[PDB]
Amino acid sequence: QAVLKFTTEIHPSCVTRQKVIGAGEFGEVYKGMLKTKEVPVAIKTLKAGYTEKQRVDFLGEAGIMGQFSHHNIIRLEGVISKYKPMMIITEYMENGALDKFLREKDGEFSVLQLVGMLRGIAAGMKYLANMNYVHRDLAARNILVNSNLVCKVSDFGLSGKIPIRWTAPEAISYRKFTSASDVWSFGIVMWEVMTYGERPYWELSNHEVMKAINDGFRLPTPMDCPSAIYQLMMQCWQQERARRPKFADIVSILDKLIRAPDSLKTLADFDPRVSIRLP
Ligand SMILES: Cc1ccc(C(=O)Nc2cccc(C(F)(F)F)c2)cc1Nc1nc(N2CC[C@H](O)C2)nc(-n2ccnc2)n1
Numbered sequence: 001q002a003v004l005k006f007t008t009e010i011h012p013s014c015v016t017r018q019k020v021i022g023a024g025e026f027g028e029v030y031k032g033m034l035k036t037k038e039v040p041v042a043i044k045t046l047k048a049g050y051t052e053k054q055r056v057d058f059l060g061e062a063g064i065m066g067q068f069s070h071h072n073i074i075r076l077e078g079v080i081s082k083y084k085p086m087m088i089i090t091e092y093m094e095n096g097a098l099d100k101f102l103r104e105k106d107g108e109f110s111v112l113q114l115v116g117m118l119r120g121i122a123a124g125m126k127y128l129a130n131m132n133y134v135h136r137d138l139a140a141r142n143i144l145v146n147s148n149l150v151c152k153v154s155d156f157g158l159s160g161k162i163p164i165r166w167t168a169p170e171a172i173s174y175r176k177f178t179s180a181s182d183v184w185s186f187g188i189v190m191w192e193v194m195t196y197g198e199r200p201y202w203e204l205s206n207h208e209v210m211k212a213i214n215d216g217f218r219l220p221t222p223m224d225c226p227s228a229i230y231q232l233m234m235q236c237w238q239q240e241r242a243r244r245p246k247f248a249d250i251v252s253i254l255d256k257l258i259r260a261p262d263s264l265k266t267l268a269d270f271d272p273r274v275s276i277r278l279p
Contacts, residue, residue, distance in 0.1 A: 003059050007066030010034070010078035010089060017043055022156065025057065026050045027085060029156075031092065034077055040092040041077055045085040055086075062088045064133065072124030074144060074154040090154075098151060099140035103197035111226060111264050114193050117151050118229075119254040124153040125186060126247035129179035136177045138185035139166045140192040164206040169213060170241055180241045186250065187236025194222040194229060213239075220271050226264040228257055 014035045022029035027045035034041045046058045065076040065088065080087040095101050098117075121143060128135055135142075137155055144152040168184035170176040188200050200219060201209045218237050221230045232253055238244050245253075257263045 003063040004066065004079060004081060005063070006069075007062055007076060008078035009082060010036075010080055010087075012080055012083050012087075015041075015043065015080070015087065015089065017045075025157065026054045034089060036077075039077075040094075042090045042092050044088040044090075046087070047085050058086060058088070065090070068127070068131065068133075070124055070127045071150065072120045072152055073127060074152045091152075093144045093146050093152070095145040095147065097141050097156075098143040098145050099192065099197050101145050101197075102140070102193065106196045111224070112258065112261055113149060115226070115229060115254060115258055115264060117145075117149060118190055118193055119251065119258060120151045121153060121189060122186065122247060122250045122254055124151070125179075125182060126251050128153065129182065129247050134177050134179055135182050135185070136171075137163060137166075138182050138189060139163055140189055140197060143189070162206075165200045165204075165209045168241070169210075169239060172210065176241075178241070179247065180244050183236050183244045183247065183250070186247075187233040188219075190229065190233040190236070191219050191222060194225045198222075213237075221268040223270050225268050225270075226257070227266045227268045228253075228263055230268040 015032060016035075017030040017032040019031045020028045021031045021042065024044045024046070026049070027047040030043040030045070032041050032043045033039065046054065050058070059079075059081060062076070062079040062081070065074070066079070068076075075091040077089045077091060079089065125135070125138065135153070135155065137158065138153070141159060142154050142156055144154050146152065164172060166185045166188045168181035171181040171184075191200060192198065201212070204212065218234060232245070232250065235243075235245055236250075
């Protein structure tokens with residue numbers, strides 16, 4: 001019962017599951033409604049037959065989500081633990097996940113709006129890191145966008161596909177996941193946002209990505225990208241873990257750039273892949 005100390009217990013009569021929107025570890029995820037007039041929610045279930053480890057992980061997940069209370073972290077509405085199936089219930093965003101959102105809205109936002117999304121993501125990550133929580137799977141697909149353009153860090157589980165091109169070298173090579181490997185991932189998220197959801201490294205295979213990184217290559221600047229933003233993402237990709245900025249440094253820089261917005265007018269040179277010659 002101590003694991004669920006920051007959570008509210010929801011009675012099953014208050015929950016209506018409507019459509020399957022995904023799969024959990026041992027159950028389905030649904031889009032539904034919560035009566036507490038009604039509010040749309042996402043609902044992850046733990047279905048009959050779950051193992052002891054699955055129960056420990058499921059209630060542990062609920063417990064930490066209840067612990068987190070931050071503008072840029074997905075909100076837990078509550079948990080059903082006293083009845084079967086057990087459920088984790090979160091807020092729901094009609095705009096959905098950030099990766100698909102940006103790809104469907106290519107070129108529709110200002111630079112200031114894009115950088116503001118990154119400041120929010122960075123604030124959520126600073127909070128998680130300070131709370132001693134290592135995310136391990138930070139990517140645009142794990143970020144929800146609300147109707148105010150506020151980004152909420154989430155974790156929907158692996159898509160399970162290993163996200164090599166979001167993962168820092170030390171986490172791939174020897175399983176060292178820390179808030180500094182999350183900083184590497186945040187740099188990739190910065191590139192995802194500024195490109196409107198382009199695939200990191202394009203058609204390179206996972207092996208080719210790792211080889212390029214080991215050889216010293218890094219993603220080139222997005223089109224129309226502020227110089228300061230590319231400089232920042234490049235510093236997230238330092239091979240030496242200890243040289244990367246901490247999330248506190250990232251938040252501070254992004255906040256200062258937004259508050260002095262002329263700083264974002266200086267653009268990094270874009271390397272064109274194709275030359276068009278006209279008079
Ligand atoms: C129900 C649910 C359960 C858990 C989580 C979750 O984040 N746990 C987590 C665990 C550890 C750390 C963090 C931390 F906070 F740190 F990052 C977060 C999110 C959702 N909620 C949810 N799940 C989906 N899924 C899952 C299957 C598909 O991918 C779609 N979709 C939406 N959704 C869609 C549109 N509006 C909302 N909501």
